[PDB]
Amino acid sequence: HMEEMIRSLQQRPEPTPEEWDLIHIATEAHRSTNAKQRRKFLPDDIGQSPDGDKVDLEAFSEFTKIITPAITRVVDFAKKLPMFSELPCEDQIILLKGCCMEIMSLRAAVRYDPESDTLTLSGEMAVKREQLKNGGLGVVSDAIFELGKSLSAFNLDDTEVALLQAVLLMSTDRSGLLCVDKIEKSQEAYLLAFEHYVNHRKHNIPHFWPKLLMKVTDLRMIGACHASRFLHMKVECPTELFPPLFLEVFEDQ
Ligand SMILES: CC(C)c1cc(Oc2c(Cl)cc(CC(=O)O)cc2Cl)ccc1O
């Protein structure tokens, strides 16, 4: 026990004005690159749940038509982060390929609406778990909805979502990177700045930070699992339906 005491005995350092700068740049890089009022729903006849793993081409088409902008927004987000913009093109590619699905999934998960039990892709199209699943994501769809439901309680604000994206972007998990050190350092700086921003928000939730950190694992699973679905998508879907950017970002794996 002694949880209440231990909790209160913990030091909650606020953000140092080095971290407040990061937290501001990042927060705006995020806000300016991610756009519920006039959100159009995706027709219930599209992707309505033989072949246990068949991909509904119609649904798939609807999602690939809006994926290029979604991917462009993540790239735009990265470009607005100093420590990223200064990296070699090759590095930016590897980083982007390594976190694009995660960030896109995070943005989808936070736009989750419990009322309608849907997600809003590109901040406009509202999709039901079934549709996104038949459209190609399969279980990954189940995973993003599961994450979206659980993130409602966290009340993440633009900054937490923003730093969470920076943390995902600045990873040295993939190979072929050049500036491993500089990225590593940006990672640690964002994590630290992120943690202090969470101390500042004072969430009425027990072990919030540790829990929010576990969401990163959820997103990386979604990311990794997405690479599989993508392969399955290339098998089951006409190549003409795959936009160029979509292919560059998820192929070669
Ligand atoms: C079906 C297939 C084309 C596919 C859909 C897919 O759906 C999403 C889309 Cl379009 C856009 C976003 C992010 C956003 O809301 O901007 C987030 C998500 Cl999860 C992600 C990866 C994929 O390979």
From Swiss-Prot:
Keyword annotations: Congenital hypothyroidism, Cytoplasm, Disease variant, DNA-binding, Metal-binding, Nucleus, Receptor, Transcription, Transcription regulation, Zinc, Zinc-finger
One annotated GO molecular function: chromatin DNA binding
Subcellular location: Nucleus
Predominant localisation class: nucleus
Signal peptide range: none
Keyword DNA-binding: yes
An individual GO BP term: negative regulation of RNA polymerase II transcription preinitiation complex assembly
Binding site for 3,3',5-triiodo-L-thyronine: R73, S122
Family affiliation: Belongs to the nuclear hormone receptor family. NR1 subfamily.
Entry text on domains: Composed of three domains: a modulating N-terminal domain, a DNA-binding domain and a C-terminal ligand-binding domain.
Entry protein name: Thyroid hormone receptor alpha
Residues of the full protein shown: 148 to 369 of 490
